[PDB]
């Protein structure tokens, strides 16, 4: 069961801002750019497809949502130095921030994906309490954007991502996720 917290395909997304898409070399932004980046990491991503599915089933989270964070956080490993982020604070495929969380397991194993998803799941739960009038789907998006900047940043539905990295964390990650549902996650 992977549908306890909402379904990614029902979320409304603007995709990647141009601060996210230009760096990567695209000439366009939004959902198209989001999906295109996502598609670039799929070969690499598919290297961990069994671990990403095991844990999503374990945690009642949608594997697409985990692949979306993994594509945005480290590019399914590609941009990491021994699982380290270039400023050295983030660790593993989901880039668990060591300042905030003592990292567990190896940078690309199940112990690491479980921990990243457990953190994701606590912020989703945190947003369900904060905003009970929202829909599950809306609380799932909130969770995802909180995953990057803290739940304190989720104040609203509509300007939740302002203050995240590139002002598009959950919009991006929600659009890459939708691409991975379409392709095996
Ligand atoms: C999973 C987790 O750690 N999420 C936390 C998130 O942290 C970001 C940092 C980034 C990252 O690693 N940046 C790269 C830095 S480096 O590699 O260049 O050095 N990877 C994480 C999600 O994107 O930041 C918060 C504080 O702003 C914490 O809210 S909190 O309120 O609970 O603090 C959330 O706990």
Q: Which of 157, 153, 147 is closest to 73 using CA atoms?
A: 147
Give residue 36's domain range: 1-185
Share in percent of the chain as helix, strand, coil (round to 5): 55, 5, 45
- d(CA 67, CA 144) in angstroms, rounded, equals 12
What residues does ligand 1 touch, defined as CB less than 6 Å away? 73, 85-90, 95-97, 100-101, 116, 119, 147-150
How far is ligand 1, taken at its centre, from the CA of residue 164, in Å?
Answer: 10
CB 85 within 8 A of CB 141: no
How far is ligand 1, taken at its centre, from the CA of residue 97, in Å?
Answer: 4
- d(CA 39, CA 57) in angstroms, rounded, equals 23
Q: Retrieve residue 180's tokens.
A: 């991975």
Q: CATH number, domain at 35?
A: 1.10.530.10
> Which are the catalytic amino acids?
73
How far is ligand 1, taken at its centre, from the CA of residue 88, in Å?
Answer: 12
CB 178 within 8 A of CB 150: no
Count of structural domains within the chain: 1
């Amino acid at each position: 069961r992977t549908d306890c917290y909402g379904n990614v395909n029902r979320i409304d997304t603007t995709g990647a801002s141009c601060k996210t898409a230009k760096p990567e070399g695209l000439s366009y932004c939004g959902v198209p750019a989001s999906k295109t980046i996502a598609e670039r990491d799929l070969k690499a991503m598919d290297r961990y497809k069994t671990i990403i599915k095991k844990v999503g089933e374990k945690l009642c989270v949608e594997p697409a949502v985990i692949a979306g964070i993994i594509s945005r956080e480290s590019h399914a490993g590609k941009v990491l130095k021994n699982g380290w982020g270039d400023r050295g604070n983030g660790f593993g495929l989901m880039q668990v921030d060591k300042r905030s969380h003592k990292p567990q397991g190896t940078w690309n194993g199940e112990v690491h994906i479980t921990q990243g998803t457990t953190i994701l799941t606590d912020f989703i739960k945190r947003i369900q309490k904060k905003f009970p009038s929202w829909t599950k789907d809306q609380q799932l998006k909130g969770g995802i954007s909180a995953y990057n900047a803290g739940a304190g940043n989720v104040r609203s539905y509509a300007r939740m991502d302002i203050g995240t990295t590139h002002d598009d964390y959950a919009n991006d990650v929600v659009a890459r996720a939708q691409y991975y549902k379409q392709h095996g996650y």
